[PDB]
Subunit: 216 residues, 8 copies
């Protein structure tokens, strides 16, 4: 129930703001005074501290937190050393931001609980949108299977779900349609799709992509 | 097989370049750092050392040829800004740019950036939902209220059937898939069973899902 | 009636001193303490502040000023970001100093009310004096027409305005003559011109330049 | 067709070089930065990379050939100073130098600079008159007391004649020109009309003009 | 005649390289500083300028050929760390690394360093025993309790025999050697004499030796 | 009885900790505040001071100490100048850490009492272990003679000291055997040696090395 | 009677110490706090001040001093600007240290009362000692004439002034002989010169140098 | 025609080099800065870019050939120190070195510098005597008590004879020379006259001269 966020960068700042917005106890820690002041209004508490300094860590009472997030990026040494201190303080859950393949590996070795690559991961998602302008967002069930949110084109305007027989034609299933903000869940065969609506389809990627090539 | 130009081979842009090329697209990698160009040389169609703030070098790249130009310059906001400005004045159709903060976004907005992205900001949200709720593995939002969520089944859910968990009536949700031992099951029948540490895909309203988590899981 | 001058450089310093000299309420703002102290005696109020910091801007009560001048030069990012903050604070009149063609463009895009290029503009004026040692100062009515202040040579000593029939000979009109500090406005045909006096002529540039080549 | 040397291709000196050359004069652009030389190469007769504090490189430029040498070095006051000192000792006829502050002016004065210029200081004054008085577009001072001013006509002045506005008797001033829609009118007759957002050129004493502004406009 | 690679030609690694080569071993000296490579060129089998954090340059060295690779990078802990990480992933049998502090040791421990060394830390102890006890010249610890010590004989011990100093019965220790004027004596007989400023080698328990020092010396 | 340690680096830090552990009066001196704070708990007293500043030296009352250790490394000039000040303050025993051959020489010239090369010296010791994996630790009696601690191999398991007739076969003598932590001093001819035990041998290096080649 | 020394470097420090030693009122001014503290005991007053800052100059009451010495070296701009401020404060006597030929020239132009080149001047003196090991010290009366202090060699031991008929042989005159510290002024013809004594000779340089070549 | 090596072409060493060469001596100028070497190239017999802390480059200079080596390195005390140390170990006969402070002198003293010089310190004294006493132009000290001084004659001394000013009896001093309008007079007769703004050379005890100044001048 107690969260600590060390390193109030673009990543950690988002985490801190979002966690706090959910009504959780969040401690924001940063070496820069300007940052601390900025996120003071976004954290339960905001304290200036050097996280590579063990005494300051104890001063924070950091052992009390079940989750501690190290979102230090540019200074790879600081990121590494901070996590190490935390593990030696027997912190249950330590999530750390990684800068490259090698940074992930050392964090792996020293007992980080979960390592994240925000930029590397988003890069993939956006690339998928670049290659395929139709795709708005998606989630991968596996290497082969995914759920995709498509932006309906002119070709689909005023067409029905039975008209788009994705179950037989593409082996897929329509999960939702979003029109002008209104949402429809598990839509009936009588439901109509208009242009520039959001269409949620489920199935194998190649089957979905094929629906895009032929259908959309 | 469109033509992409990627300016700024950082953690973000690097991923884009590697991923775009992997799909078999024509991608030009451009960076001011010579060491980077060598590194991503094996991942791009062409890799060229260039300063994107330099108009002559920009024309030398033949940037007019590209329908999509990606500005993935982060740390140097002025360079990020100045690059986009040149690109807009070169009448590039689609200019996608990485933003560092709220104000960087606004300036990119004003000078006519086509798509602005906040990788860290967006991931912060995604990760935060997992921090607050260890059960959620991944998700997608259909709207402000409705979302599709991938759940990690607990001991509490072991060996239970979909008809036993009538989420359609009890929680107004629907199970979309179950992933067991790597094997995947789509549109599972009411007789299908769920075991612990499997991946469970549920669809519905946020509050309805969270309630299922508190009571079911 | 309320003026704010941010960035007390060579440009802003001149503005601040000159505005204050006219008896206007001027707030001088600079990140450098030495500057603030220096222009303290030249401003109504002088306050140390980082203009890229939004809270300090509100602390200044900058919304209260009808005119805010951003005279930050070297740090182009600061100049840009400051103006942006001001526009988002709905400041009526925002005048900003530009460093180059590109800086003008972004300031243009983000809603600057007037953009100025002090060095670029003066460069032209001085170049005109370099090419033509006779010219002291001028103003352009258009691309073709201008009013010019000439330094009278030996060729013009003790000559009259009717003797210099600029209305017929060059299609121009003499507006003023300055002798030893004494000024003459709308001078009569009987007025005499002595060497090293200031002569103010009006007409087309080529006609004026021709008067210089032939007359002076 | 005199010979000009321009040392310091900054915002100021750059303008000078571009403008002088545009008039068809022989201009030599000299700068310590190689990137600058390339940039202004297209705007100068000759463009040479050189350190103006280096006497041998100075002679290599053949600076003795120039009747006018412009020192437009600003930020580096020592370089600005040291360049002028060399030039004076090379018996250059006319040495014009950019000054950064009051004291820089004094030293340039003492070592025999022929013309010292304060671009920002001078513009500050010009701009300030427009800030305090939005009606004034541009102006020139005949003396400490008398000036010629270009005014932006308001709604209050729309469709009024010059004889209706007898500024010669009422304010002791004279209208010199009216600019309408780009079209220009010189020495306008008393029957000539002025419409809003036109350019109005008035001549007289400062207080007389300002009074006309308060009452007329 | 094993194969050694020495990364980091510092005070520590430099000594290693010089000493290993002196014994007639194949040693490859590798350093990022070009000046260093030249300096230790005369002390290594091969001397190559290389960045040990660069994987391609690492393979170029043929580091796989070496059974022993010594990371003697100190000041730059990230480089020290990153080098070891690469080496472990290249499946190098024995990787010995210099540590700067306690935490640097831990990370080296976790990523599978085979031997970690603390030269300054270890010497600090050795030197400290001489500071506190000027009589001890050098020593070796058999355990936490038992050690072998080299003592500097005082005036108090001059011309005394080993049978006169029955350290075996009186202190439970044994004299192992006496060094006189450079001449060395091993397993000295009970009749052997000790003169001042000679080197005396004693073996036993720490407290027993120190007591002999207080009473004997 | 009074010790001063100037320069709390890796070397000096070890000295300070070890001297203090022995229950000696130790004054830790460092220019860095973080260091001083760190070794505050390891020194009798810890004081921030610049040792190149003579007044601060007198302020420490440094004349009172019989032993002063200068463990400044990176800044060779500071190391040199500090020692010089100390000698001019007539300090009895001044021990100084050296960085290179040349630093030793100047310290030699200005009257340092003992000069130490920690890294250079350890380099030799470790190299001996690299070349000979059997060697754990050693001490040199001279250029030729040494006492060596060997790690017993399979070849020596369950063998006796008379079986290893080092007195006749190699002209050496066994001094101790360490088994599972238990130690044996001046071991009897009946004593057994098991694998991975610690074996202490005394004699000429070549004789010992030969025992390793043939015996072990 | 009032002296100010700005810039407590090697040059200014010597001046300040030497002037103060003579019992004069000396104000030491330096931007570096450590310097100020150091020369505090050597000045009547020692004050931290930036001499390029006009207000601090007035704060010192620098107009009160008849002599102000600017001994700023490395920062040529500071040296120049300081002197300029002083001249504009109408300081009677302004002595300034110069770094090069060009620095002398600008100081010349802005009204420095005396400009000094300590290093350049000493360089000559020492060079004269290098070329001629016999010369200890000297003073030039002109380009041709000088007074020289010579170190007597073996060739001159136990020789008399009439024996060294410098008035006829070399056209010179002996002014003094220094033996073991004892000094002799206007020495008589009976005075003896012993080896390694100090001999003071007056005349033309070439005549003196010739005496060295032939006599000494 | 001895052989001189000059390390450190600063204000001090530069003067030495120029002056030594002017007298027609073989002088080798050595400096780490390439720009300096070019500058003093015209003033030295040979001018070579070299790092004096580099032993190999030092031998490359053939520094053993020189009987005199001048270390005129100031700012970088470690380089100044390290250079001298190398030179002493190369058994150079006479090593003259510039000192920056008291402690730099001591270290140079200890490592066997043959002559140590304090240009600024020495000049400070000379200049100070002129500051306190505007009448003195230049001087030389015979000892702690006795000195020879060059005085600037005032109005008070105009048209006075040497017999009128019997400094030999009245002040125990002697006039050595009078310089008038550039013309010089040595061993002037008692009938010789002194006019204002001439140069007057007086010899004697410091207090005797100063007293003559107070009373005579
Ligand atoms: N030693 C430290 N202790 C605590 N906080 C630190 C330390 N070093 C850096 N930080 C903080 O961590 C924050 C994030 O670091 P930084 O912004 O350099 O990483 P980044 O790669 O830019 O991350 P992002 O991708 O989120 O922008 C910074 O705000 C910084 O103040
Ligand atoms: N003017 C320029 N011209 C060309 N390339 C540039 C320019 N400025 C920066 N870059 C390149 O852009 C790349 C991305 O910038 P950088 O990685 O510093 O941003 P970042 O905030 O760290 O992004 P990420 O979050 O992906 O780490 C850099 O590798 C740099 O080489
Ligand atoms: N972030 C900031 N907030 C407020 N003031 C700033 C900031 N950054 C710089 N300034 C101030 O703006 C002033 C002008 O900037 P600067 O002098 O570098 O521009 P410049 O190009 O030299 O302008 P000029 O042409 O007038 O000399 C400086 O005095 C500086 O103190
Ligand atoms: N020693 C030198 N030799 C030759 N060129 C020089 C030297 N020093 C500076 N310059 C050049 O002078 C140019 C003008 O200087 P700079 O632009 O820094 O002055 P500024 O105050 O910024 O002027 P502006 O107000 O025009 O921006 C610089 O572009 C620089 O390349
Ligand atoms: N990335 C790298 N690749 C190759 N060599 C490196 C790298 N980083 C550092 N080195 C080299 O490692 C050497 C040793 O590092 P350094 O001497 O700074 O450590 P140290 O703590 O000073 O060790 P010592 O105690 O021996 O002085 C340096 O000489 C440097 O040239
Ligand atoms: N002028 C000074 N006065 C006092 N202490 C100083 C001074 N300069 C440096 N020190 C201290 O000396 C300590 C050791 O110096 P440093 O660590 O740079 O040497 P090192 O070569 O790294 O030594 P080691 O081999 O022990 O790591 C540092 O902690 C530093 O704070
Ligand atoms: N702006 C300033 N105002 C006052 N004092 C200053 C200023 N800048 C420098 N100084 C002082 O002037 C002193 C002399 O300057 P510096 O030592 O750099 O010249 P230098 O060439 O080394 O002179 P020297 O030949 O005597 O060693 C320094 O102690 C410094 O603190
Ligand atoms: N390691 C080195 N090898 C060769 N030359 C060097 C080295 N270090 C310094 N020098 C040269 O010595 C010269 C003199 O040093 P520097 O002029 O900085 O001393 P300084 O105190 O300024 O002397 P001065 O009082 O004459 O100005 C410098 O020009 C520099 O080029
Ligand atoms: Mg990032
Ligand atoms: Mg400017
Ligand atoms: Mg070390
Ligand atoms: Mg000097």
């Amino acid at each position: 129930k107690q969260f600590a966020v060390i390193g109030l960068g673009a990543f950690g700042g988002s985490i801190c703001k979002e966690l706090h917005r959910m009504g959780h106890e969040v401690l924001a820690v940063d070496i820069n005074e300007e940052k601390v002041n900025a996120y003071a209004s976004y954290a339960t508490h905001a304290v200036i501290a050097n996280a590579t300094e063990e005494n300051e860590l104890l001063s924070l009472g950091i052992r009390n937190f079940e989750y501690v997030i190290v979102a230090i990026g540019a200074n790879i040494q600081a990121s590494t050393l901070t996590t190490l201190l935390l593990k030696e303080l027997d912190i249950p859950n330590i999530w750390v931001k990684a800068q490259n393949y090698y940074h992930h590996k050392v964090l792996e070795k020293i007992g980080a609980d979960r390592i994240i690559h925000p930029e590397k991961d988003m890069g993939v998602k956006i690339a998928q949108s670049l290659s395929d302008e139709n795709v708005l967002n998606y989630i991968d069930l596996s290497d082969e299977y995914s759920i995709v949110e498509l932006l309906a084109t002119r070709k689909l305007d005023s067409k029905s779900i039975i008209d788009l027989n994705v179950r037989a034609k593409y082996g897929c299933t329509i999960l939702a349609i979003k029109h002008h903000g209104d949402i429809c869940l598990s839509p009936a065969p009588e439901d109509i799709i208009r242009e520039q609506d959001c269409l949620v389809i489920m199935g194998h990627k190649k089957d979905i992509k094929r629906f895009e090539n032929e259908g959309m």
